[PDB]
Amino acid sequence: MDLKVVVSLSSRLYTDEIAKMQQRIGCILPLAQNVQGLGLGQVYSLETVPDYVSMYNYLSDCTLAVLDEVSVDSLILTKIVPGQTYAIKNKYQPFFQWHGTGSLSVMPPVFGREHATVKLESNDVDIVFPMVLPTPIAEEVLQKILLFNVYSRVVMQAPGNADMLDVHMHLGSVSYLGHHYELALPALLDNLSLYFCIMVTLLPRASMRLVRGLNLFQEMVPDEIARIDLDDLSVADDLSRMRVMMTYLQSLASLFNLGPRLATAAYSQETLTATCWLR
Amino acid sequence: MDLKVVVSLSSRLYTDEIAKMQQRIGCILPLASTHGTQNVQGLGLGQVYSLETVPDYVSMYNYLSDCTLAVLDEVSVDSLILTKIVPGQTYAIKNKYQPFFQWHGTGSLSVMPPVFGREHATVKLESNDVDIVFPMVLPTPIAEEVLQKILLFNVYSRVVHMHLGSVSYLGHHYELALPEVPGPLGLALLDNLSLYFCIMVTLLPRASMRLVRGLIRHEHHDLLNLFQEMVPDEIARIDLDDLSVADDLSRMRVMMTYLQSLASLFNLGPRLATAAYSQETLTATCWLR
Amino acid sequence: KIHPGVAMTVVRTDEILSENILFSSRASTSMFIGTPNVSRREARVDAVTF
Amino acid sequence: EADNQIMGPSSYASFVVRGENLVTAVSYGRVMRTFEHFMARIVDSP
Amino acid sequence: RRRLQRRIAGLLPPPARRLNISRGSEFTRDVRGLVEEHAQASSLSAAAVWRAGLLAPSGWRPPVFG
Amino acid sequence: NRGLYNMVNEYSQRLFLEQPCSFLQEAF
Amino acid sequence: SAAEGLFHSFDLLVGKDAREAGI
Amino acid sequence: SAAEGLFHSFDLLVGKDAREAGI
Amino acid sequence: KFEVLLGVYTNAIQYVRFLETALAVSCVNTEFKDLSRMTDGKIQFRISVPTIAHGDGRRPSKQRTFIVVKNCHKHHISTEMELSMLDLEILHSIPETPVEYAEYVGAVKTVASALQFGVDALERGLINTVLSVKLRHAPPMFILQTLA
């Protein structure tokens, strides 16, 4: 069908802007037509605090678009449908090889704002493209930035229990299919880390309420340090704790579903593109 | 490709029933079969949600997951015509549901069992002895908290419950009916959640307890308001251990897979991905996610 | 009713539903209007939709 | 004053019968002619 | 070439129907062709199964190969 | 201010807007 | 309504020799 | 431009039977 | 048997055209009839500027023909016409009996009515696109009055 979506650029684009838009022409980006909220650039603006979860919810709510052609006044781009496929390319400056992986994950770029962006001086907007990366790399960088945020805030509060070089030796590198990448580890990622923290703190009393809902079978599998909490807590506090914990558990589970998960068939490393459909 | 179901009545639809069905045009209806001509006895959600038995919503969720979905376009005498929902086509779905949730954010919708009551969407046929109930279509941020209220009422029947009984929205509060017993399959989902929790409680990390301890004693966030400035002792006796990275990294990989499995468990019912919702026309161009 | 040591200048927007006038001179734009395409969409036994 | 008098009908209107002309069909040219008369009246106003 | 022309000419998409709203006599024959197209693309005959092979490029999708 | 400059110089070089009063950033 | 079971043979136009609208 | 290598045989005037200006 | 004389009131609707309305003064509209033949979005403007013969300075100059280029916007409106099945089945089988001529005239009337609503919807979408591309390129008066 007719799928060519154009966006309204106010000012004409100069030569270096044309080159920087040509450099990443194969990548995908979301959509809100306005060039102001054209992508993820309104969460990564200097206007809001760079919070991960609102960025993820906006990225999973709104549609995606892979752009085909660039001009001095127009941006030819086709939005994503669940029906057919589009040929997309890996044009991200943190380069992850899409060798034979059947899935691609679309997440906000956690490797720094400058690494995946184009800054438009002449226009009103500074656009960003999300990270399209294979899903074991996606869950691995989620692990190694989540645990690094935890093990960093801990040594900011108390540096007597852990070591910063000990967590930076392992939690700064991912190793998928023999490729060894390095993680730009510097704020960011604090609300997701504290969400996970609240979940694993209130999950003991959650598991106790669940096993008391329906006996020693499910009470043997906790260890002795994982079993003992005293049986005295208020009704309203317990109910609000369970409700807020299950809310954060549902949001955290749908968040560790990595969003719009793209799928690929034929990765051609000579031309750096793969036939990509929405799944 | 003809995508059009002509569900035919046996008996004559009276004029008030024609008005009540013409009031509901564009709403989601689940079908029994995907074929071109069907019967009414089997149209809708009434075969799983009957008046005689308890409202069990988890089997209704799996019914809405399994069977096909159709929108209602034309209603006339002796017959009402539906349009199926296939992937690859954009459908117009209007908000004609009685607990009104405004779709201002154009969020992804969700198809629900009628948890808010039967009798507002019960729409009754006195032609033939059948009751057509229309599933609730509503965004997934409301849907997760409605599903958690359904799952939490059964475990808080034993031990304020009006907060769990009703729903929370930006503009209004609506009352949704809870049963005293969930049912067999709701108890099965609660049992699977209990086994998941009683297994995953030992596979929890140790480092984030030091974070919550130093953050309680140091700096109150808006998110740290639930503890009422108190820490339990289980946190302390799991913080009598020293922190390493290897067992925590393996534990966070199995925690990633377990949180993906919980994402598989909570995601019940169909979801619709909206695009270009019109608030003035009150319909939304949607497709199946 | 004591006057404090500061002075406040209160600013508010006012949304006004106006009625514009559009002028456009003789032969301003030029339209290239083509003959429309017709595609039979709904192959229904009840009513056809083109 | 744009005028001091207006022209109107001198009599009450009468209900005209329409829909029951049982005159026979002339030919295929008659049904094709009334088809072309009804269909091309979409694009021809006077 | 004659075999190739006879093979390509049968395997061709049918052209889209035009309604010239502007002219008078063209609108009548175009809607005449419209009803003559529906009446032979709907009824039980070999004409309605002849219409299904033209595929009119949503329903059919050539797949990807590895 | 860049919108005012671009419009005024664009009309000069020749020989879009959401609110008329929005270019003049002064309240009444 | 009024035509709940009735056919109609013709109608009576309101003196309109070329117009189909009205009573 | 568009005519960077092309000849042109004729042009199509915008219904102007005696005017040469316009599209 | 004549059993009731029911009175119904059919609504009189004004069917508008783009030439019958009066904002066709603004637009010189042509029948291109195949818009895929123009693939280039940009139309070349050859603005030729005349010159005044100044004899006083004796600084003679030929005409300064400059060239700007301007984009051609394209718009795509789509409505649907609902023709029923049985009336098209009557319209295909032309009858010869003078009792089925009336059913043929009824089918022609309802098909022409649905076609007229479709054509009127297209001629109300033409006017809407023309008003949209007039109001897109219309600066306010308080700037254009002193700018022009």
Gap from E55 CA to chain A (nearest CA, Å): 14
Count CB atoms within 10 A of the CB of residue C32: 17
Interface-testing mutation among C38, C41, C49, with chain E (most E C-beta atoms within 10 A): C38
Residue A264: closest CA among A63, A68, A65, A104: A104
**E38 neighbourhood in chain I, CB within 8 Å:** 83, 88
Question: Could you tell me the CA-to-CA distances from G18 to B50, D6, G14, G22 in Å, in that order?
Answer: 58, 23, 11, 12
**E41 neighbourhood in chain B, CB within 8 Å:** none
Interface of B with A in 153-192 (CB under 8 A): 154-156, 158-161, 163-164, 187, 190-191
Interface-testing mutation among F16, F18, F28, with chain I (most I C-beta atoms within 10 A): F16
Q: Report residue A190 as tokens.
A: 């604090």
Q: β-strand B5-8 against B37-39: which pairing, if any?
A: parallel
Q: What is the largest CA-CA distance in chain B?
A: 76
Count CB atoms within 10 A of the CB of residue B225: 10
Q: Report residue A239 as tokens.
A: 């109910």
Contact E18, C36 (CB under 8 A): yes
For chain A, the three-class secondary structure string (H helix, E strand, C coil) is CCCEECCCCCCCCCHHHHHHHHHCCCCEEECCCCCCCCCCCCCCCCCCCCCHHHHHHHHHHCCEEEEEEECCCCEEEEECCCCCEEEEECCCCCCCCCCCCCEEEEECCCCCCCCCEECCCCCCCCEECCEEEEHHHHHHHHHHHHHHHHHHHHHHHCCCCCCHHHHHHHCCEEEECCEEEECCCCCCCHHHHHHHHHHHHHHHHHHHHHHHHCCCHHHHCCCCCCCCCCCCCCHHHHHHHHHHHHHHHHHHHHHCCCCCEEEEEEEECCCCEEEEEEC
Q: Report residue C2 as tokens.
A: 């004591």
Phi-psi region of D18 (alpha: psi -120 to 50; beta: other; left: phi over 0): beta
Q: Report residue A83 as tokens.
A: 């029906």
Gap from A78 CA to chain E (nearest CA, Å): 16
Q: Residues near D11 by Cβ (< 8 Å), separated by ≥ 6?
A: none
Question: Could you tell me the CA-to-CA distances from E57 to A87, D17, E52, E62, I122 in Å, in that order?
Answer: 20, 50, 12, 12, 24
Residue I91: closest CA among I110, I66, I76, I74: I110
Strands laid side by side in the A273-278 sheet: A85-89, A273-278, A261-268, A103-107, A131-134
Contact A143, A185 (CB under 8 A): no
Q: What are phi and psi of D22, to 5 degrees?
A: -95, 30
What is the signed CA dihedral for B11, B13, B14, B17, rounded to 10 degrees? Answer: 140
Residue B209: closest CA among A192, A145, A238, A200: A200
Contact A71, A159 (CB under 8 A): no
Breaks in chain F at C–N > 2.5 Å: after which residues?
A: 15
The DSSP bridge partners found for residue A133 are A105
Residue I31: closest CA among I16, I21, I19, I23: I19
Q: How far apart are CA B44 and CA B82, in angstroms?
A: 11
Question: Could you tell me the CA-to-CA distances from G4 to B9, B12, G1, G7 in Å, in that order?
Answer: 20, 14, 6, 9
SS3 state at B61: helix
Phi-psi region of E55 (alpha: psi -120 to 50; beta: other; left: phi over 0): left
The DSSP bridge partners found for residue I71 are I42
Which residue type sits at A204?
A: P
Contact assignment for D16 to G9 by CB distance below 8 Å: no
Interface-testing mutation among I115, I116, I122, I123, with chain E (most E C-beta atoms within 10 A): I115
Span between the terminal Cα atoms of chain H, in Å: 17
Residue contacts between C and E (CB atoms, under 8 Å): 27
- 10 Å CB burial of residue D17 (0-12, 13-18, 19+) is exposed
Q: How far apart are CA I116 and CA B108, in angstroms?
A: 38
> What count of Cα atoms within 13 Å lies in the side-chain half-sphere of residue B34?
9
Q: How far apart are CA G17 and CA E45, in angstroms?
A: 43
Q: How far apart are CA B133 and CA I34, in angstroms?
A: 50
Question: Could you tell me the CA-to-CA distances from D28 to A133, D39, F8, I98, I111 in Å, in that order?
Answer: 70, 16, 68, 12, 19
Contact assignment for D13 to G15 by CB distance below 8 Å: yes
Q: What are phi and psi of F12, to 5 degrees?
A: -70, -35
Contact A108, A55 (CB under 8 A): yes
Residue with token string 């390319």: A89
Q: How far apart are CA B153 and CA B13, in angstroms?
A: 40
Q: What are phi and psi of B249, to 5 degrees?
A: -75, -40
Interface of C with E in 7-46 (CB under 8 A): 33, 35-40, 43
Residue A38: closest CA among A121, A122, A118, A134: A118
Question: Could you tell me the CA-to-CA distances from A243 to A206, A208, B205, H4 in Å, in that order?
Answer: 10, 15, 22, 69
Which residue type sits at B25?
A: I
Residue B18: closest CA among B95, B80, B97: B80
Q: How far apart are CA B289 and CA B277, in angstroms?
A: 16
- 10 Å CB burial of residue B116 (0-12, 13-18, 19+) is buried
Contact B288, B270 (CB under 8 A): yes
SS3 state at G12: strand
Contact B83, C46 (CB under 8 A): no
Q: Residues near E64 by Cβ (< 8 Å), separated by ≥ 6?
A: A85, A265, A266, A275
Measured in angstroms, the resolution is 3.8
Q: Residues near E21 by Cβ (< 8 Å), separated by ≥ 6?
A: C35, C36, D42, D43, E27, I119, I122, I123
Distance of CA B197 to the CA centre of its chain: 22
Contact F8, I147 (CB under 8 A): yes
Out of B87, B205, B237, the one facing A83 most closely (by C-beta) is B87
Q: How far apart are CA B165 and CA B116, in angstroms?
A: 10
Contact assignment for C44 to B4 by CB distance below 8 Å: yes
Contact assignment for I10 to G22 by CB distance below 8 Å: yes
Question: Could you tell me the CA-to-CA distances from A240 to A191, A246, I40 in Å, in that order?
Answer: 20, 10, 63
SS3 state at C47: strand
Q: What are phi and psi of A198, to 5 degrees?
A: -60, -40
Q: Report residue A174 as tokens.
A: 């991912």
Method: cryo-EM
Residue A241: closest CA among A213, A199, A194, A191: A199
**C42 neighbourhood in chain B, CB within 8 Å:** 2, 4
Count CB atoms within 10 A of the CB of residue B151: 22
DSSP B288: E
Q: Report residue D17 as tokens.
A: 């019968």
Distance of CA C33 to the CA centre of its chain: 23
Residue B128: closest CA among B215, B47, B39: B39
Out of E17, E22, E42, the one facing C37 most closely (by C-beta) is E17
- 10 Å CB burial of residue I64 (0-12, 13-18, 19+) is exposed
The DSSP bridge partners found for residue B143 are none
Contact assignment for I112 to D34 by CB distance below 8 Å: no
Contact A64, A3 (CB under 8 A): no
Contact I106, I100 (CB under 8 A): no
**I20 neighbourhood in chain D, CB within 8 Å:** 45
Burial B123-150 (b: 16+ CB within 10 A, else e): bebeeeebbbbbbbbbbbbbbbbbbbbb
Contact B134, B82 (CB under 8 A): no
SS3 state at E60: coil
Contact assignment for D43 to E25 by CB distance below 8 Å: no
SS3 state at B192: helix
Alpha helices, DSSP H only, in chain B? 15-22, 58-66, 140-153, 161-165, 184-200, 207-218, 234-238, 246-266
**G14 neighbourhood in chain D, CB within 8 Å:** 13, 15
Chains in contact with I, counting 3 or more C-beta pairs less than 8 Å apart as contact: C, D, E, F, G, H
Q: How many separate helices (H) and strands (E) can be counted in chain G?
A: 0, 1
Span between the terminal Cα atoms of chain D, in Å: 31
SS3 state at B130: strand
B275: contact with C, CB 8 A cutoff: no
Distance of CA E28 to the CA centre of its chain: 20
**D44 neighbourhood in chain I, CB within 8 Å:** none
Alpha helices, DSSP H only, in I65-140? 85-92, 101-136
> What count of Cα atoms within 13 Å lies in the side-chain half-sphere of residue B17?
20
Q: β-strand A64-70 against A28-30: which pairing, if any?
A: antiparallel
Q: How far apart are CA C38 and CA I81, in angstroms?
A: 10
**I140 neighbourhood in chain F, CB within 8 Å:** 17, 20
Contact assignment for C38 to E21 by CB distance below 8 Å: no
Contact assignment for A83 to E64 by CB distance below 8 Å: no
Q: Report residue C31 as tokens.
A: 């339209």
Which long-range CB contacts under 8 A does D5-13 form with residues at least 24 apart? D13/G14, D13/G15
C49: contact with E, CB 8 A cutoff: no
Question: Could you tell me the CA-to-CA distances from B226 to A75, A157, B229 in Å, in that order?
Answer: 48, 20, 8
Q: How far apart are CA B135 and CA B63, in angstroms?
A: 11
DSSP secondary structure string for all residues of H1-23: ---SS--------SS-SS-----
Contact A74, A4 (CB under 8 A): no
Residue A244: closest CA among B144, B169, B236: B144
